[PDB]
Structure formats: structure tokens, C-alpha cells
């Protein structure tokens, strides 16, 4: 099973003029690796892929892969609506040394099932890298159903997992039973912090979730506890994880909130975010702080 | 009132290797102008803006505007999820000679109302061109409500209309009452063929709809009949427009169907569409042809 | 084709203690018959079926059929969630002299397709009367799709029409092509005022819509004009019908709005509605009046 | 805090002619009480309220309250669309000796917020019994949001809890923060088996869930372990609860499944269900059996 465990969707740190902030992104990467994460995911939703141009995304990916320098597995999010660009970004990720790509379904047009299968097959065929699918139906408007994901894993042996970002036990349970039932080493990762624990108990493989940026230790230690068979300890971590997503209501998009939390939790990076997101206002920053303090995270 | 009447969302004609087909796109543009349309809208949904890169979009807009050569007003669709790219595409449109830009709401993240207002304001402030809003909630997952549109038209004097793409009489009626009630010259255009007649009877201003590519005469003659007070004639065109959208069920996306209909209706252009769309298969092309024959369109 | 033309969903007039108001309901029935409607529909949504007990519904239907005294065809809405009660109400309708029953899908549980087909087949088999389906997905949360309605019409020869209450030209168009294409005399009636014209132009059969209560002459004259081939005149009535549904935004449920409009349009019936609906407040009644005045309806 | 802990939504056992099976319903009640449940809830969605007439529901409720004979607190489901009937059923519950009522929002019309509050205020005013609200937005089409529920708890001192049936950690979390934050003893209960453990860890109070019928011991022992501070033991029960809901996919409605499971788990009751539900077929009964065997439940 590839890409299991705790794999943060790393925030992309930008300077005040919206350029890649290399020292801050580097320091964040180093923080997370030192926290004991099982891999790093660049250019996910939290990484602001959808607010970035293709050349910017290539620059960020190359920078990130190079800085990680093989210390942990690296995933690059290469998806979007422009399928020709997805191939280009995916081939580029492979050339630059990524260990895998994560590919959402096209989220403007909700393409017919035949076009959607064809799309993922074509992307998968464009690289020799492992491909993780990315389901986020609240944003895409089109669910990657367990049956379809199983069909995609039957069709291409390099389609080897899914980040399933959805507040639904049922969807995770059914993703696991359907796809892992036919493909035992297919990887199932939840995209929300407060689903990590259930995803493990259900027989899935970990999480790619926002709190990996600012409190990776909670997920890392939950996974470690769980793997040690200390379920009670794991449940204790889960109890923090259950509360964390309160903070994501502070704004939409909440990429600003995540970066503000990285600062409050002890890593001073620029919190600039790209339009149409915007800076978090002071009242909400203090709110975020009180939440982090209540959870003993800063 | 700016940009009223029948303004097709012009198909972008591509060669087999996916490049701008300049002779074919020119020929289509000339066809529509000589059919009597009131304006031309490039790089809408039907123009495949979301499957194109930014440089590609710039080249297509420049070519298109240049070929129209001021014979009719030209709109350029500049929207996306990358707000910095929206500004750059909009400023480019303006420098390239466009008459207006058409801006959809960001369709990945459904940004908070505050961010959404700020986004459109920023875009409007980046140009001195008129700005048309674009509502397509089936695709975007976020409705531009009549109240929100009113608030945008109240905030910025260059936000002067909307393409409201929705199968909903209520939405069109409410957009008209709420926005045109406060701003008599704000332009309301429907984005669907079969809502043109109702839009006119409701006090709105016309349509930007797919059949403008392959049967502009139906909409052009409907509008003329309407303005002439020949309601019965208008209704007869309406009856054809009511039936046309059957064909869009043949695939999703249906940009392929639109281009196949351009060919069937007398204009031999390449029908290549960009991934993740795909060629219409021969059985469905034959269906399409039967429909178009039944409607007396070819 | 059975039950075509203009068939109002008649308001049930109650006294202040919530009992059936026989003189008010009789006077309303007689007004509608005198206006030239083609049938009358009791205990639809606008008749408050879902706020009434079964014995009250039986009393209402009995009274209504008896007062109509075969002057026009009579439909009784017999639907709900309690399927045994639907059979009872539908058998009672038949015994009481109704010309047909209107049956919505169960709207609590959204029952599986097999359960749904079996439900309708069992209801249809409990009576020898014609059965009109009723689709109101905004309220039911489960659409009767054209394919499913075709399947029901293919299964039972007494399932002979549908009231399709949905603000969607596509749904109406497709209901007509799919069902009427297989069953030319299957009846298609829209449930919204502003879709009657389009329904007629699309090849469907008329409307069962709230304004039949207070302005039946609009729909009646529209249908007559249409049948006479005077399309311009029909479109002129359509223009009024396009504007009427503004008033339904005044409250939810808007049964109160409809009875307040019957009064304002010149028939003084009691406007009591059953909980959880409530009386329309005076400022909104005055807005209603202004509306009706602007439309030349009172 | 009232009605905390494990409170099954009890199946109503019917004979083959669809009458109340008193010996079977009595035996099931006695099994649940013996299993250590903290209360019993009759005529919830699982008790088939929506397929029963009012007099039927009165007779069931009276039978049930009588048979419980005050051994544990008894809740009666008195909701529906007929608001006058809700008051009648609720006053009847009170007279018959119930300890509280559980009241869903009206689920045909989605009544305005003003009408909704008024509805719940009027039912709460009709009885001196504690009222539990019942949120089931997948069926009702109208969410009882934490803000609204807080407004209801501020308005009436006998509105003292909620059954929150939704597959959503966020909703449960926010219900708890918002309502219990203002009303510490307001009761929050989840309606799904696989949310019990999270509900407890979030600060809620228990569950009313389907598996309380055929495996009450899992929930009872999870609650006991949690209250004992034996989190690891609670998590082990949770793991069973995570898997149980697979069986509810077997049919819709799945009231048949729950009753088949009561049989398989050792209590021979008639499994008859009311239309429009229908008997579970043998293949699916066997599937249920294999699931229950895998979970060590039969």
C-alpha cells in the first residue's frame, strides 16, 4: 500500500507580493518532516492549486520536491479543468522527481462517466508514477463513487489510492469495502481531520488533512498509537481532531486560517494567500488563537 | 443598455492537434455576423475557456477581436478560479480591443459572500471596460442571486449585465425585477435557448445561447419579430428553440454536439474539442442530424 | 387524452375553527366552472391535503364532487406517506363519484425505485378510475423522472397523466418526448402558472396551477387563444402568467397568499389556512393587492 | 439532562394483516429493557410513524406506554405534516402516560422559519411534557440548524433535546457547541449508529439509533465503558457500530432490514412492514445474516 499514514496537504507559503516564499515553505516542510509525517502533498486544495497558474505550479512543485530531497514520499496535485494541462503538470511532476500525483476530477463541467473514466485513464497513462484520485464533491459537484473508483483501479494498475474529502462515515466505509475489497492495497485516505480515527478503524490508511500543517503531532501520534494497539491513546488524539475543524468556519476559503494557525503554533511564516481568498481579520485571528489555546496546540 | 439582443457564445474551432483553427473560426464569426447577431461572445463555456491555458485564451481573444474588426460588439470571457489570471485576462482583453468582459464566479471554492463581492469589484476595477456577470450554478455550485447581483451593480458602475444560465423562469424573473428594478439599463441575458422568449416577455434583454452557433437566424428572427410587435411570429421561433436543447443531452460536455451541428447546418469546420470532452460518435451524430432535419434547420 | 386543459388546484375554504366552509368552497367551485375551466382538482398541495386528516379529506372530497355535480371532470388528490391510506382515500374517491385520482410519490422516505413502482401499481390496481401522477420534487425530494413515468404508463393502462410541478423547461420537454412519444394520449400538465404556454408549445396538455383559483380567465383565455391558433393572444396571457408567481414569495407555504388573492379578485371567502401555514400579514396583503392591481387582475 | 444515553427507536411489530402485534412488540420491549437501555422511543422513523394513521398511532403508543409500565422513560413520536394532528397525538401521549414526545419538522412543505418556530412553540405549548426535536434533513429536506434549535430552546423551557439524524460530524459538533453552549443540559442524541462514539467525545449525550433494536448491548456497553473511563473498550464497540450501517443499504425503507435483524439476532417476531415498504427478499436476508455473523451479533 502506497502513500499510507499522515500526509499533510502542505500550505504554499507566499510573500507579500504573491511570490513563492522559499525560506518559509522550506521551514514548513522541515517542520513537518521532523514531526514524523509519512509524506508531503504539495498543490492540494490547501496548497492553493486553483489560484495558481501552470508555470507557477511547476515552479512550486520543483522547489518542493528538491527541498524534500527524498526524505519522505512527495505527492504533487496536478489536477484542474484543463486536461491537457493536467498531463503536462503530471509529466512535469514525474520529470522533477515526485513520487506520485494526486488528481481531482474536472470540477467546472461535470463530465459524463465515459469522459471521466477516459480522463483518469489518460492521465494515468501519461506517467509511470502512482496516481492518487482526489474526491471533493462539496467543491467539484461530482462524486467519485466507490463503484467508479473501483472501476478506475480495475482499469489502471497505477491508480492506487484516493483522498476522500467528505464529511461522511458512509462514503469512507463504502470506499473502503468496495475498493479495498477488490484491491487490498488500494490506499484510502480521508481529507478531513475529524475522520482520521474512523478511517483507520474502518480499515483505511490515514489522512491528508489541513491540521497536518499546524498540529501534525496530533495525527502522527494518533497513527502511532493506533499502530501500537493503544486505541485509548489514539481516541484521545481523535478527541482533539474532532474539535479542530471549528476553525475552518472562520473564513471561506480557509487557506488563510490554516496559515494563521501555523504561525500561532510556532512557525512564523508569511500568511499571504492568493485571491479570491483574503487575509484573515484580527478578530477572527484572535478567535483562532483561543481555539488553538483551548486545544493545547499553542 | 449594453450588449442586448442575440450574442452567441461562439465555439472555438480547433485543428486536430488542438490549435486555434483561424480559417474555421473566422468563417463561423462571419456566418454569425451576417446572420444579424447583436454581438459575439468568445471563450464562454461553449468556447471551452476551462479547457484552455491562459496564453491560449489570450491568443484566441486577440484573433477573434481582430477578425470581428468592430463589426459587432465583442465580449471576452476572462473568468476562472485564478483571480490574478482573471485580472490579467481582462486587462489583456481590454488592450486587445474587446468591448466588454464576461466574468463567472470562481467555481472551485465557493468563496464567502464577502470574498465574492471583493473578487468582482477587483476585477471590475482592473479595467475600464463594461463587465457582464456570468451565472451558471449547475456548473459552479454557487448561485449569483438577484440580491447579490443587485449589490454588485450598486457597488460598481461598470458591472452592467449578466448572463444568467439556469433552467428557471423564477430566477430570470427575479433577476429582472430585483436588478433591472434598481438599474433600468442593466442588461439581463439568458444562457439557455429555450428561455429567450420568456426573458423578452419578462422585460429582459436577450440571450447568449448555444444555438446561436448553428441556427442564429432562429434567435435573430425571434428578437426582430418581438421588436416588430409580431408576437405570434416570435412564438413560432420560440417553438423551435423549445425543442433544440434535446440535442445537448447527446453528450456531456456537449461542445462537441454544438460543433457537429454547425457542420450539419452548412458550415464545414473541424469539430475537434479539447479533453476532457471527446468526439461525438457516429450513432449520436446521426441522431443529431435527424433532430436538426425535424426542426428544419438543415 | 384525459383531464386536459385548465384544471385548477382548488383552494379548500375553511371556517375560523378549521372546518370545511361549504358555502365559500361552493362559491369558489361555481366561479371556476363559470370561468370555463376544463376540470377541478381538490386536495392538491394548494388544497392543503397534507395538513388534513383522512376523514376530513373524505368529507371534503365528498362535498366537492357532489357540489360539482358532474358539470366538469373532478380529480381528487389521495396521496401521502401512508400507502394503506392512499388506497382507502382513492377507493373512497371512486365510490364518491370522482372522475380520477392524483397521486404524489411518498414524500417522507424516498423509497427505492422497486418500492415506488410497486406503490403506484398497487394504487392504480385499487381503483378502476384513471390515475394522474403528481411530481413535485422541490417538496418530495424525489423526482418522478420521465423514464420512470414512462415505465409506470407502460405498466398500467389507467396511469394516464401527470402533473409535473417543477420550474424546468427541460423536465417538461423531456416528460413530453419520453412519455407522450410512447403514449400519445398520456396527459402532461405543468403545475406552475408560468409554464402553461411553454407546455402547450412543447406538445403537452395544459396546467393545474395556483392562479386558476383567482384568475382562471387568464389560463382559460390562453388555452382558448392557443386552440384558436391565435398565438399572439395566448402569448399576451402568458405575459400575465409570467408575472403572477411573484406573489408566491410572500409566504411559505403560500396557500394563504392564494386565498387572499381569491378575495382581492372579487370572491369574499374566508382565508383561514391550516397550521403549520398561518395568516398573511397586512403589509404583505397590501403588497399582494398592488401586484394584482399592476397585473389588472382586480 | 433528560433522555440521555441509549434510547432505541423501537420497531413496531405488526402481524401479517398489518395489525399491531402485541406479543411481538411486548417481547421486543422486554428484550431492550433487559439489555440496559436508558429509554424507549416509539413511533420514530424506524417505528414506521409515517405509514400509520393517527388512531393507529394512538393505539400503538398507549399499548407501548402501558407495557413499559414506567420501567424506563418512554418517548412518543407525534410528528407529521398535519400540525393539528401533532397537537392531538402529543396531548394523547401525555394523557396516556408518556414521559416525552419527539417531534420532527413538517416534511412536505418546508415552512418559512417564522412558521417553523411557531409550529414547534405551539406543540411545546400543547403539552407539559418535555419535547425532543427531531432533525432528519435527508428525509425532511429542511435542516434544523444549531442556531434555530438554540432559538427554540431559548423560547420554550420544555424543548430540552434533539435527535440529530445526519451523517455529519460538523453538524453534531456544531449542534453541541451552539445549543449546549447556551443550555448545558439540553440533550444531544445522534440518530445514526456510527456516530454514537463521536457524539460522546464531542460532549453529546447518546443515540437513538436503529441497531438499538437487534444489538442494544453494543451501544449500552459502549456507553458504560465510556462512562467508566474505559475508552479503549468503548472504541472496540464503536468499531462494530462503524460497520453495522452497511446493512441499511439492503433496502429503502430499511425498516424490513431492522426487523429481519431482530429475528436473526435471536427474537422471533413477525417482520411484516407497512406499505410502501415491502418484505426483504431471501438473497438480501442471507446477506444481512452474513453481515451479522461477521460482526459476531448472531
PDB file of N, CA and C in Angstrom, chain B residues 110-167:
ATOM      1  N   UNK B 110     -16.264  27.720  -3.259  1.00  0.00           N
ATOM      2  CA  UNK B 110     -17.412  28.626  -3.295  1.00  0.00           C
ATOM      3  C   UNK B 110     -17.081  29.626  -2.179  1.00  0.00           C
ATOM      4  N   UNK B 111     -16.453  30.702  -2.600  1.00  0.00           N
ATOM      5  CA  UNK B 111     -15.896  31.735  -1.732  1.00  0.00           C
ATOM      6  C   UNK B 111     -17.070  32.435  -1.008  1.00  0.00           C
ATOM      7  N   UNK B 112     -16.809  32.857   0.216  1.00  0.00           N
ATOM      8  CA  UNK B 112     -17.751  33.579   1.045  1.00  0.00           C
ATOM      9  C   UNK B 112     -18.256  34.779   0.256  1.00  0.00           C
ATOM     10  N   UNK B 113     -19.444  35.224   0.616  1.00  0.00           N
ATOM     11  CA  UNK B 113     -20.044  36.386   0.011  1.00  0.00           C
ATOM     12  C   UNK B 113     -19.133  37.600   0.028  1.00  0.00           C
ATOM     13  N   UNK B 114     -18.475  37.827   1.165  1.00  0.00           N
ATOM     14  CA  UNK B 114     -17.524  38.943   1.254  1.00  0.00           C
ATOM     15  C   UNK B 114     -16.371  38.805   0.226  1.00  0.00           C
ATOM     16  N   UNK B 115     -15.830  37.608   0.096  1.00  0.00           N
ATOM     17  CA  UNK B 115     -14.749  37.391  -0.854  1.00  0.00           C
ATOM     18  C   UNK B 115     -15.267  37.517  -2.280  1.00  0.00           C
ATOM     19  N   UNK B 116     -16.493  37.061  -2.474  1.00  0.00           N
ATOM     20  CA  UNK B 116     -17.085  37.048  -3.819  1.00  0.00           C
ATOM     21  C   UNK B 116     -17.359  38.495  -4.311  1.00  0.00           C
ATOM     22  N   UNK B 117     -17.935  39.312  -3.441  1.00  0.00           N
ATOM     23  CA  UNK B 117     -18.143  40.717  -3.769  1.00  0.00           C
ATOM     24  C   UNK B 117     -16.774  41.401  -4.086  1.00  0.00           C
ATOM     25  N   UNK B 118     -15.790  41.165  -3.211  1.00  0.00           N
ATOM     26  CA  UNK B 118     -14.455  41.703  -3.354  1.00  0.00           C
ATOM     27  C   UNK B 118     -13.847  41.250  -4.657  1.00  0.00           C
ATOM     28  N   UNK B 119     -13.987  39.971  -5.004  1.00  0.00           N
ATOM     29  CA  UNK B 119     -13.450  39.449  -6.267  1.00  0.00           C
ATOM     30  C   UNK B 119     -13.992  40.274  -7.498  1.00  0.00           C
ATOM     31  N   UNK B 120     -15.306  40.316  -7.618  1.00  0.00           N
ATOM     32  CA  UNK B 120     -15.928  41.007  -8.743  1.00  0.00           C
ATOM     33  C   UNK B 120     -15.578  42.506  -8.782  1.00  0.00           C
ATOM     34  N   UNK B 121     -15.588  43.171  -7.612  1.00  0.00           N
ATOM     35  CA  UNK B 121     -15.155  44.552  -7.502  1.00  0.00           C
ATOM     36  C   UNK B 121     -13.714  44.734  -8.052  1.00  0.00           C
ATOM     37  N   UNK B 122     -12.794  43.897  -7.571  1.00  0.00           N
ATOM     38  CA  UNK B 122     -11.409  43.901  -8.034  1.00  0.00           C
ATOM     39  C   UNK B 122     -11.304  43.689  -9.508  1.00  0.00           C
ATOM     40  N   UNK B 123     -12.039  42.738 -10.009  1.00  0.00           N
ATOM     41  CA  UNK B 123     -11.997  42.569 -11.432  1.00  0.00           C
ATOM     42  C   UNK B 123     -12.558  43.784 -12.175  1.00  0.00           C
ATOM     43  N   UNK B 124     -13.665  44.316 -11.700  1.00  0.00           N
ATOM     44  CA  UNK B 124     -14.284  45.455 -12.356  1.00  0.00           C
ATOM     45  C   UNK B 124     -13.312  46.642 -12.328  1.00  0.00           C
ATOM     46  N   UNK B 125     -12.574  46.778 -11.229  1.00  0.00           N
ATOM     47  CA  UNK B 125     -11.651  47.917 -11.018  1.00  0.00           C
ATOM     48  C   UNK B 125     -10.400  47.756 -11.820  1.00  0.00           C
ATOM     49  N   UNK B 126     -10.176  46.562 -12.387  1.00  0.00           N
ATOM     50  CA  UNK B 126      -8.922  46.329 -13.111  1.00  0.00           C
ATOM     51  C   UNK B 126      -9.043  46.800 -14.559  1.00  0.00           C
ATOM     52  N   UNK B 127     -10.264  47.087 -15.005  1.00  0.00           N
ATOM     53  CA  UNK B 127     -10.466  47.511 -16.389  1.00  0.00           C
ATOM     54  C   UNK B 127     -11.372  48.724 -16.436  1.00  0.00           C
ATOM     55  N   UNK B 128     -11.382  49.408 -17.570  1.00  0.00           N
ATOM     56  CA  UNK B 128     -12.390  50.424 -17.754  1.00  0.00           C
ATOM     57  C   UNK B 128     -13.512  49.934 -18.654  1.00  0.00           C
ATOM     58  N   UNK B 129     -13.458  48.687 -19.071  1.00  0.00           N
ATOM     59  CA  UNK B 129     -14.495  48.068 -19.920  1.00  0.00           C
ATOM     60  C   UNK B 129     -15.754  47.805 -19.122  1.00  0.00           C
ATOM     61  N   UNK B 130     -16.920  47.791 -19.794  1.00  0.00           N
ATOM     62  CA  UNK B 130     -18.107  47.158 -19.182  1.00  0.00           C
ATOM     63  C   UNK B 130     -17.862  45.690 -18.767  1.00  0.00           C
ATOM     64  N   UNK B 131     -18.455  45.283 -17.653  1.00  0.00           N
ATOM     65  CA  UNK B 131     -18.340  43.884 -17.164  1.00  0.00           C
ATOM     66  C   UNK B 131     -19.721  43.264 -17.110  1.00  0.00           C
ATOM     67  N   UNK B 132     -19.871  42.121 -17.760  1.00  0.00           N
ATOM     68  CA  UNK B 132     -21.051  41.247 -17.634  1.00  0.00           C
ATOM     69  C   UNK B 132     -20.704  40.125 -16.666  1.00  0.00           C
ATOM     70  N   UNK B 133     -21.619  39.887 -15.723  1.00  0.00           N
ATOM     71  CA  UNK B 133     -21.516  38.760 -14.807  1.00  0.00           C
ATOM     72  C   UNK B 133     -21.940  37.520 -15.533  1.00  0.00           C
ATOM     73  N   UNK B 134     -21.523  36.365 -15.023  1.00  0.00           N
ATOM     74  CA  UNK B 134     -21.949  35.103 -15.636  1.00  0.00           C
ATOM     75  C   UNK B 134     -22.360  34.153 -14.497  1.00  0.00           C
ATOM     76  N   UNK B 135     -23.656  33.795 -14.462  1.00  0.00           N
ATOM     77  CA  UNK B 135     -24.193  32.853 -13.503  1.00  0.00           C
ATOM     78  C   UNK B 135     -24.476  31.499 -14.165  1.00  0.00           C
ATOM     79  N   UNK B 136     -23.872  30.422 -13.651  1.00  0.00           N
ATOM     80  CA  UNK B 136     -24.070  29.089 -14.197  1.00  0.00           C
ATOM     81  C   UNK B 136     -24.019  28.104 -13.007  1.00  0.00           C
ATOM     82  N   UNK B 137     -25.013  28.179 -12.120  1.00  0.00           N
ATOM     83  CA  UNK B 137     -24.944  27.469 -10.852  1.00  0.00           C
ATOM     84  C   UNK B 137     -24.916  25.932 -11.002  1.00  0.00           C
ATOM     85  N   UNK B 138     -25.504  25.401 -12.067  1.00  0.00           N
ATOM     86  CA  UNK B 138     -25.349  23.957 -12.308  1.00  0.00           C
ATOM     87  C   UNK B 138     -23.876  23.536 -12.345  1.00  0.00           C
ATOM     88  N   UNK B 139     -22.995  24.430 -12.842  1.00  0.00           N
ATOM     89  CA  UNK B 139     -21.588  24.084 -13.020  1.00  0.00           C
ATOM     90  C   UNK B 139     -20.801  24.602 -11.857  1.00  0.00           C
ATOM     91  N   UNK B 140     -21.128  25.821 -11.387  1.00  0.00           N
ATOM     92  CA  UNK B 140     -20.327  26.486 -10.416  1.00  0.00           C
ATOM     93  C   UNK B 140     -20.638  26.035  -8.985  1.00  0.00           C
ATOM     94  N   UNK B 141     -21.869  25.554  -8.725  1.00  0.00           N
ATOM     95  CA  UNK B 141     -22.271  25.165  -7.383  1.00  0.00           C
ATOM     96  C   UNK B 141     -22.433  26.380  -6.491  1.00  0.00           C
ATOM     97  N   UNK B 142     -22.537  27.566  -7.109  1.00  0.00           N
ATOM     98  CA  UNK B 142     -22.755  28.766  -6.300  1.00  0.00           C
ATOM     99  C   UNK B 142     -23.579  29.757  -7.112  1.00  0.00           C
ATOM    100  N   UNK B 143     -24.811  29.987  -6.670  1.00  0.00           N
ATOM    101  CA  UNK B 143     -25.704  30.869  -7.381  1.00  0.00           C
ATOM    102  C   UNK B 143     -25.366  32.382  -7.187  1.00  0.00           C
ATOM    103  N   UNK B 144     -25.344  33.147  -8.282  1.00  0.00           N
ATOM    104  CA  UNK B 144     -25.370  34.588  -8.188  1.00  0.00           C
ATOM    105  C   UNK B 144     -26.825  34.993  -8.010  1.00  0.00           C
ATOM    106  N   UNK B 145     -27.231  35.244  -6.793  1.00  0.00           N
ATOM    107  CA  UNK B 145     -28.630  35.513  -6.525  1.00  0.00           C
ATOM    108  C   UNK B 145     -28.958  36.927  -7.048  1.00  0.00           C
ATOM    109  N   UNK B 146     -30.226  37.156  -7.343  1.00  0.00           N
ATOM    110  CA  UNK B 146     -30.616  38.527  -7.782  1.00  0.00           C
ATOM    111  C   UNK B 146     -30.178  39.618  -6.775  1.00  0.00           C
ATOM    112  N   UNK B 147     -30.247  39.329  -5.463  1.00  0.00           N
ATOM    113  CA  UNK B 147     -29.852  40.263  -4.408  1.00  0.00           C
ATOM    114  C   UNK B 147     -28.358  40.566  -4.462  1.00  0.00           C
ATOM    115  N   UNK B 148     -27.564  39.512  -4.693  1.00  0.00           N
ATOM    116  CA  UNK B 148     -26.112  39.664  -4.834  1.00  0.00           C
ATOM    117  C   UNK B 148     -25.716  40.451  -6.078  1.00  0.00           C
ATOM    118  N   UNK B 149     -26.395  40.155  -7.169  1.00  0.00           N
ATOM    119  CA  UNK B 149     -26.198  40.880  -8.420  1.00  0.00           C
ATOM    120  C   UNK B 149     -26.601  42.331  -8.278  1.00  0.00           C
ATOM    121  N   UNK B 150     -27.737  42.588  -7.631  1.00  0.00           N
ATOM    122  CA  UNK B 150     -28.083  43.977  -7.311  1.00  0.00           C
ATOM    123  C   UNK B 150     -26.977  44.725  -6.516  1.00  0.00           C
ATOM    124  N   UNK B 151     -26.507  44.100  -5.441  1.00  0.00           N
ATOM    125  CA  UNK B 151     -25.395  44.618  -4.637  1.00  0.00           C
ATOM    126  C   UNK B 151     -24.154  44.869  -5.511  1.00  0.00           C
ATOM    127  N   UNK B 152     -23.777  43.938  -6.431  1.00  0.00           N
ATOM    128  CA  UNK B 152     -22.654  44.246  -7.342  1.00  0.00           C
ATOM    129  C   UNK B 152     -22.925  45.449  -8.272  1.00  0.00           C
ATOM    130  N   UNK B 153     -24.115  45.487  -8.873  1.00  0.00           N
ATOM    131  CA  UNK B 153     -24.439  46.622  -9.780  1.00  0.00           C
ATOM    132  C   UNK B 153     -24.537  47.972  -9.015  1.00  0.00           C
ATOM    133  N   UNK B 154     -24.986  47.959  -7.751  1.00  0.00           N
ATOM    134  CA  UNK B 154     -24.942  49.108  -6.850  1.00  0.00           C
ATOM    135  C   UNK B 154     -23.492  49.546  -6.528  1.00  0.00           C
ATOM    136  N   UNK B 155     -22.591  48.592  -6.357  1.00  0.00           N
ATOM    137  CA  UNK B 155     -21.218  48.902  -5.987  1.00  0.00           C
ATOM    138  C   UNK B 155     -20.350  49.449  -7.138  1.00  0.00           C
ATOM    139  N   UNK B 156     -20.518  48.924  -8.358  1.00  0.00           N
ATOM    140  CA  UNK B 156     -19.692  49.280  -9.459  1.00  0.00           C
ATOM    141  C   UNK B 156     -20.455  49.618 -10.738  1.00  0.00           C
ATOM    142  N   UNK B 157     -20.167  50.786 -11.305  1.00  0.00           N
ATOM    143  CA  UNK B 157     -20.985  51.322 -12.383  1.00  0.00           C
ATOM    144  C   UNK B 157     -20.604  50.645 -13.652  1.00  0.00           C
ATOM    145  N   UNK B 158     -19.445  49.992 -13.702  1.00  0.00           N
ATOM    146  CA  UNK B 158     -19.124  49.149 -14.925  1.00  0.00           C
ATOM    147  C   UNK B 158     -19.574  47.670 -14.940  1.00  0.00           C
ATOM    148  N   UNK B 159     -20.224  47.249 -13.870  1.00  0.00           N
ATOM    149  CA  UNK B 159     -20.947  45.976 -13.827  1.00  0.00           C
ATOM    150  C   UNK B 159     -22.348  46.270 -14.297  1.00  0.00           C
ATOM    151  N   UNK B 160     -22.566  45.973 -15.551  1.00  0.00           N
ATOM    152  CA  UNK B 160     -23.766  46.456 -16.287  1.00  0.00           C
ATOM    153  C   UNK B 160     -24.678  45.350 -16.900  1.00  0.00           C
ATOM    154  N   UNK B 161     -24.408  44.070 -16.572  1.00  0.00           N
ATOM    155  CA  UNK B 161     -25.303  42.998 -17.025  1.00  0.00           C
ATOM    156  C   UNK B 161     -24.935  41.628 -16.493  1.00  0.00           C
ATOM    157  N   UNK B 162     -25.649  40.621 -16.977  1.00  0.00           N
ATOM    158  CA  UNK B 162     -25.461  39.262 -16.508  1.00  0.00           C
ATOM    159  C   UNK B 162     -26.003  38.321 -17.557  1.00  0.00           C
ATOM    160  N   UNK B 163     -25.266  37.338 -17.847  1.00  0.00           N
ATOM    161  CA  UNK B 163     -25.691  36.114 -18.475  1.00  0.00           C
ATOM    162  C   UNK B 163     -26.169  35.066 -17.479  1.00  0.00           C
ATOM    163  N   UNK B 164     -27.444  34.912 -17.479  1.00  0.00           N
ATOM    164  CA  UNK B 164     -27.985  34.077 -16.337  1.00  0.00           C
ATOM    165  C   UNK B 164     -28.334  32.720 -16.938  1.00  0.00           C
ATOM    166  N   UNK B 165     -27.432  31.741 -16.740  1.00  0.00           N
ATOM    167  CA  UNK B 165     -27.567  30.423 -17.373  1.00  0.00           C
ATOM    168  C   UNK B 165     -28.201  29.459 -16.366  1.00  0.00           C
ATOM    169  N   UNK B 166     -29.505  29.261 -16.474  1.00  0.00           N
ATOM    170  CA  UNK B 166     -30.233  28.474 -15.468  1.00  0.00           C
ATOM    171  C   UNK B 166     -31.596  28.104 -16.048  1.00  0.00           C
ATOM    172  N   UNK B 167     -31.987  26.851 -15.869  1.00  0.00           N
ATOM    173  CA  UNK B 167     -33.359  26.453 -16.328  1.00  0.00           C
ATOM    174  C   UNK B 167     -34.365  26.860 -15.239  1.00  0.00           C
TER     175      UNK B 167
END
